[PDB]
Amino acid sequence: ELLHAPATVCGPKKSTNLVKNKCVNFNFNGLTGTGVLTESNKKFLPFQQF
Amino acid sequence: FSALEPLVDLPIGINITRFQTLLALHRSYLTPGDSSSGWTAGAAAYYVG
């Protein structure tokens, strides 16, 4: 049953292995992009996500 | 100046047009301890904007 409330049951998401230092297509929590991943020094606030 | 941070998000689907606040009443043996004169409101102030 689907109502005006947001959907909350679905197929579990699958986490593929992380790839570093190579131009790769990525999808982080629904954010899609094409770039190179690198370790970053900057520190985020706990509630902030990107 | 104060910055306010997110705490929780609820997925409820209700519609709200009015609300109310709930207060704590102190009952003890130093007062009658009844609903007529035994209650005490203590000290508290809340501002609504």
Swiss-Prot record, chain A:
Effect of residue 32 to K: In strain: Omicron/BA.1
Span list, region Disordered: 4-26
Domain of life: Viruses
Summary of the function given for this chain in its UniProt record: Attaches the virion to the cell membrane by interacting with host receptor, initiating the infection. The major receptor is host ACE2. When S2/S2' has been cleaved, binding to the receptor triggers direct fusion at the cell membrane. When S2/S2' has not been cleaved, binding to the receptor results in internalization of the virus by endocytosis using host TFRC and GRM2 and leading to fusion of the virion membrane with the host endosomal membrane. Alternatively, may use NRP1/NRP2 and integrin as entry receptors.
Known partners and oligomeric status: Binds to host ACE2. RBD also interacts with the N-linked glycan on 'Asn-90' of ACE2. Cleavage of S generates a polybasic C-terminal sequence on S1 that binds to host Neuropilin-1 (NRP1) and Neuropilin-2 (NRP2) receptors. Interacts with host integrin alpha-5/beta-1 (ITGA5:ITGB1) and with ACE2 in complex with integrin alpha-5/beta-1 (ITGA5:ITGB1). May interact via cytoplasmic c-terminus with M protein. May interact (via N-terminus) with host bilirubin and biliverdin, thereby preventing antibody binding to the SARS-CoV-2 spike NTD via an allosteric mechanism.
Protein name, as recorded: Spike protein S1
